[PDB]
Each structure stands twice: as structure tokens, then as C-alpha cells.
Design a protein around this ligand. Structure first.
Ligand SMILES: O=c1cc[nH]c(=O)[nH]1
Ligand code: SF4
Length: 206
């Protein structure tokens, strides 16, 4: 099912990342430039999972390099977390997108639950490889990937979760996606930013 047969029997992240470049576990590899695997090392204590690569990531080959990534860097720095000590990845490894006439960017399209479940074997391989103490789930798609399709990020802010079907039983912390913090009225964005820093500090204190 899905990406399972494309995942090699190794925990080496370089070899996992190369294998993901050849994945056909769902249809998203066709239109994307390349797979965008996670970034960071296997000594990382904190793993962070977003939704999917965006336009910039699809061409950089690295996660969280665009506007959402700059906000996240801001939040990490405010939380006194070294981004270089984390392992950062996404629930889905190929950019799902469309373009609109007049657009200044390729527009992300939400992965279906089918695509998320298809790609999840890579996430399981990354978690097995890294053995994080805590997993930060950034946004609804990532959080649902590990916590169930009905899970609501908005109802469990600040909470340390543990689920039995997750390898290694890491602590799980689900928080707002940094893209959500990019727009809205200033006071709303500032309150939301503080809440993201709070959730990152809860994860870091596990
Ligand atoms: O890597 C990235 C970039 C933007 N949004 C995500 O969910 N992940
Ligand atoms: S999104 Fe995931 S499952 Fe689908 S082709 Fe890409 S790596 Fe494979």
C-alpha cells in the first residue's frame, strides 16, 4: 500500500532521501520537481512535521525555506530552539499544486487523506531513524497524519499527547501551521505567534 515498497530497509537518512526521489506511492511525484525529504540529523531530539513542500521548497529541495519557514525560524529563535538541532520534514514529500493566471506563485493544494496515508511510510521511517523525544505537528494535515483524521488542532493547543500506534511513543504536540500566522489582523497574528512559541516551548521541555 502506498509508498511502503519504495521505502528501503535502512535508517540512513541520505539513503531514505534518495529512495524517496524514486517514490511513486501516490500520483504527486508526476508534476512535482523532486521529492523534498526531511532536513536535519538522527541525533535530533525534536522532530517537526509540516504539511507538504511549497513552491520554494519544491525547487530548493529543503523544507520550510519560504515565508512560512521564515516565520517558524522567528518562532524557534524566540523559543530558544536551534533549528539546526531539529529534524524537520512534511507529511507529504511531493508538492501538490496548481497555478492561477496572474499568480506570482504555484498555489499549494491540500493533500487528500489518501495521499497522506500513502506517504506516511516515509514519516514512519524518519521517526524510526531519528527516534525523537517529541514530535511537533504543524497544522491539521500533519497532526491528522499521526493522531487520526478527526483530530482538531484547534481543540488541543498546549497539550502533550501520546498515542499507542506511534513508533517509539514520542511525546506529540500539535500546533498551528506557521502559514496561518502570515495573514490576519495584527493583534490576531501577534497572539497566534505567542501561542506558537508557547507550544514550541512545551515540546522543547519534554
Ligand atoms: O516545508 C514546508 C513549507 C511550507 N509548508 C509546509 O507545510 N512545509
Ligand atoms: S507524495 Fe509521498 S507517497 Fe506520494 S509519490 Fe511523493 S514520496 Fe511517494
Amino acid at each position: 500500500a502506498g509508498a511502503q515498497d519504495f521505502v528501503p530497509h535502512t535508517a540512513d537518512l541520505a539513503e531514505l532521501a534518495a529512495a524517496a526521489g524514486e517514490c511513486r506511492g501516490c500520483g504527486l511525484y508526476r508534476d512535482a520537481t523532486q521529492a523534498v525529504f526531511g532536513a536535519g540529523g538522527r541525533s535530533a531530539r525534536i522532530m517537526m512535521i509540516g504539511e507538504q513542500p511549497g513552491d520554494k521548497e519544491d525547487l530548493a529541495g529543503l523544507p520550510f525555506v519560504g515565508p512560512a519557514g521564515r516565520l517558524l525560524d522567528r518562532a524557534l529563535e524566540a523559543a530558544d530552539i536551534d533549528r539546526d538541532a531539529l529534524y524537520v520534514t512534511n507529511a507529504v514529500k511531493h508538492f501538490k499544486f496548481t497555478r492561477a493566471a496572474g499568480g506570482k506563485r504555484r498555489i499549494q493544494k491540500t493533500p487528500s487523506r489518501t495521499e497522506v496515508v500513502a506517504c506516511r511510510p516515509w514519516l514512519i521511517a524518519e521517526m524510526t531513524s531519528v527516534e525523537p523525544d517529541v514530535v511537533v505537528l504543524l497544522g491539521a494535515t500533519a497532526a491528522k497524519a499521526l493522531l487520526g483524521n478527526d483530530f482538531r488542532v484547534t481543540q488541543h493547543r498546549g497539550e502533550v499527547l501520546h498515542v499507542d500506534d506511534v513508533p517509539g511513543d514520542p511525546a506529540l504536540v500539535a500546533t498551528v501551521h506557521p502559514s496561518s500566522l502570515l495573514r490576519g489582523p495584527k493583534e490576531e497574528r501577534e497572539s497566534a505567534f505567542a501561542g506558537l512559541v508557547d507550544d514550541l516551548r512545551v515540546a522543547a521541555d519534554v
